[PDB]
Symmetry: C3
Subunit: 149 residues, 3 copies
């Protein structure tokens, strides 16, 4: 009994793991995930940067970051409005870095941006043109999370 | 060995449970669930109130109920068309009650409504502009379920 | 007590099985699955027929198959563009069959189709107005999968 039931439950657990993996594949598919491409998702809610980071972190994802023009357009299409990107110069003013770490390898700054305007701007929002504008991390913009290809 | 295998399997199960909860959170988010707000969702199918109740119950949710103007707008945008709300005045005519219990707090009745028109109207539909109209429970309207925040 | 921990594990696993089933049901509901009806899903990606089959099969579904006009309309609404159907005449030219078996019954061919045009056309796409056109299986069209009622 004991050992047989124990061996069975290991197979029951592996079966459930396979099923959950499949469920995740189906949900990603219905969410628009393209083959071998990272995908972006939003609940269309606007909130401050820290809340977006906490929200995407919970979902085991990260705040959306475009690494090229294609991804930048992908994020733009998903958000439909201004959306925070996972990029900030909070550590050293004027020096933008990915929240995941490192200096920028691609950018699409609007003319004369980033400018740390007025009282200060350490976050970044992709606007309705695909262009970028640094803005207050306290302002509320659309939450867009990113998941791996 | 046995006690160690069992311990290791309990660990795997806990991990699977967390992963499943993550799948549920990502799904709700992708479908528009707002932070700290109830999750409203529909399959766009129209059916009698009894069927709507059975359907949401089977999903472990309940027929959508607007507790305030914010929730009412939320349900309105998810439904798109006329949809049943989890409210009826089946016990005492004129006394609308939530299917989950309690007297109606918030309401958004249309002019000249509720009117218990014709042979009687004990159910409620959110219609145009998000206003409410009492209607026959046997009539077919969109099924919108709600899940907790 | 080993036996008590084992019985609890059995209860934990069964609880997970029920919860995963609920997650699958809720996701299908959110994706538009109507009661007693099969449902269709797409990620809007365009690809050759063999890729669509492979992808749908992996999700334990199949390339969408319109068995009647209601389903055809449903597939048309989900796809939004030209999409492959789970129907081909690869086995015997001129004789269309479902990928899962059986000779084609209901059909919605555009005038003068199918025509096995040029070097040949053994696949089928639902196009404009929801009508059908036989096309090369090597061409890339929208991937739409169907799942059981
Ligand atoms: O130009 C500036 O306009 C302000 C309204 C604000 O958007 C700043 O971020 C811009 O740099
Ligand atoms: O006015 C009435 O019109 C009927 C057609 C029905 O919609 C009733 O519920 C309304 O109160
Ligand atoms: O008519 C034909 O036009 C070709 C361009 C191709 O679409 C064929 O499948 C059609 O039968
Ligand atoms: Ca600063
Ligand atoms: Ca700055
Ligand atoms: Ca700026
Ligand atoms: Ca009555
Ligand atoms: Ca009444
Ligand atoms: Ca009425
Ligand atoms: Ca042929
Ligand atoms: Ca010919
Ligand atoms: Ca042919
Ligand atoms: Ca043709
Ligand atoms: Cl700031
Ligand atoms: Cl009634
Ligand atoms: Cl072909």
């Amino acid at each position: 009994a004991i050992e047989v039931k124990l061996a069975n439950m290991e197979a029951e657990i592996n079966t459930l793991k396979s099923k959950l993996e499949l469920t995740n594949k189906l949900h990603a598919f219905s969410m628009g995930k393209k083959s071998g491409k990272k995908f972006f998702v939003t609940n269309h809610e606007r909130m401050p940067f820290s809340k977006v980071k906490a929200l995407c972190s919970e979902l085991r994802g990260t705040v959306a970051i475009p690494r090229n023009a294609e991804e930048n357009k992908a994020i733009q299409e998903v958000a439909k409005t201004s959306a925070f990107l996972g990029i900030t110069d909070e550590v050293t003013e004027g020096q933008f870095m990915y929240v995941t770490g490192g200096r920028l390898t691609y950018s699409n700054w609007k003319k004369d941006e980033p400018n740390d305007h007025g009282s200060g701007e350490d976050c970044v929002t992709i606007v309705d043109n695909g262009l970028w504008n640094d803005i207050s991390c306290q302002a509320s913009h659309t939450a867009v999370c990113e998941f791996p290809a």
